[PDB]
C-alpha cells in the first residue's frame, strides 16, 4: 500500500536508501553478471580480482576502460533523479537522506546526490598500488596507451600494453601502477566506510532498498539491523515475492520511485 508507505515517508526524519545493480541496469549500464554479461570471453567475476590484475593488468585495464567509456553515453534515470531531488528537498527541511550504493558508476553523483557512500568504490577513482593515494579520474582516455582500446567483441585483439604505459601515479617520485579504486572479488569492504554506514543505519527511521533485495547482499548486512529496531523497510525492485505475502513495490524503480518519493 503506497498510501501507508507515504504516511511513513511524511514522518521520517532520516532515510537510508540502499541501491543495487537494478538501478544501474535501467540506465543502460551493463553489470556483466547474468547471461548477457560477457565482455570478450569473460564475465565480471573472472576479471574483477587481484589475481587477474596481477597476471594481466593490461586486460583488466582494457575492461575498466571500456566501462568508463560507456558511462559517457549512459545517463541517470528517473530513480536516481528522484533520490537526488528528495535529498535536496528534505535537507532544506532539516531531514536527512543518505544513499548507500553497491554501484560504482557514479550515477548517483551525476544525478545530484551529495550524501553518498560508495561501498564498492568507483569506476572513476584510482588507487596507487605503490603509495596508496586515491584520486578522482574522469579522463577519456585515462592514459594515451588505452585510447581506442577495450572493444568488447570476443575476437578483438588484446592491446598488451606494457605495464609502464598503463595509468601511472602522478607524483613524479612514486610513479606507481594505478588500479581502479573498486572493491574486487576476494577483497574486504573498507572498515571506515562500514563504520559510517552503521552509524547512519542505526540513526535512520525509514529505509528503502532499491534495485536489489533486502534478503540478498549487501542489504542482508544492514537491513536486518534496521528492521530489528522496528524500522519500516521498503523494497523497490523488479523481483517478485510469492502470493502469501514491511513493503514491496514491484517494477522498474524509475517508474515506482518518483511517485513514491513525490
Amino acid at each position: 500500500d503506497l498510501t501507508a508507505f507515504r504516511e511513513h515517508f511524511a514522518k521520517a526524519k532520516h532515510i537510508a536508501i540502499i541501491t543495487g545493480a537494478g538501478v544501474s541496469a535501467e540506465s543502460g549500464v551493463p553489470t556483466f553478471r547474468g547471461p548477457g554479461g560477457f565482455w570478450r570471453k569473460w564475465q565480471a567475476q573472472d576479471l574483477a580480482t587481484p589475481e587477474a590484475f596481477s597476471r594481466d593488468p593490461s586486460l583488466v585495464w582494457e575492461f575498466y576502460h571500456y566501462r568508463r567509456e560507456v558511462m559517457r553515453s549512459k545517463m541517470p534515470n528517473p530513480a536516481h533523479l528522484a533520490i537526488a531531488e528528495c535529498e535536496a528537498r528534505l535537507g532544506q527541511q532539516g531531514r536527512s537522506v543518505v544513499i548507500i550504493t553497491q554501484n560504482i558508476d557514479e550515477l548517483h553523483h551525476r544525478a545530484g546526490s551529495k550524501h553518498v557512500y560508495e561501498i564498492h568504490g568507483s569506476l572513476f577513482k584510482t588507487r596507487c598500488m605503490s603509495c596508496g593515494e586515491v584520486k578522482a579520474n574522469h579522463k577519456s582516455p585515462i592514459c594515451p596507451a588505452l585510447d581506442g582500446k577495450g572493444a568488447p567483441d570476443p575476437n578483438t585483439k588484446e592491446a598488451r600494453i606494457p605495464v609502464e604505459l598503463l595509468p601511472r601515479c602522478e607524483r613524479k617520485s612514486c610513479n606507481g601502477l594505478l588500479r581502479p579504486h573498486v572493491v574486487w572479488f576476494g577483497e574486504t569492504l573498507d572498515s571506515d566506510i562500514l563504520t559510517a554506514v552503521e552509524r547512519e543505519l542505526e540513526k535512520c527511521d525509514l529505509c528503502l532498498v532499491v534495485g536489489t533485495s533486502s534478503i540478498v547482499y549487501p542489504a542482508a548486512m544492514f537491513a536486518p539491523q534496521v528492521a530489528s529496531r522496528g524500522v519500516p523497510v521498503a523494497e523497490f525492485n523488479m523481483e517478485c515475492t510469492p502470493a502469501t505475502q514491511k513493503y514491496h513495490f514491484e517494477g522498474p524503480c524509475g517508474s515506482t520511485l518518483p511517485p513514491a518519493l513525490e
Binding site: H120, V183, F185, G186, E187, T188, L189, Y217, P218, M221
Partner: peptide, 8 residues
Amino acid sequence: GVLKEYGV
C-alpha cells in the same frame, strides 16, 4: 573485514 559478497 567483510568479504565482497561474503566470498560466495
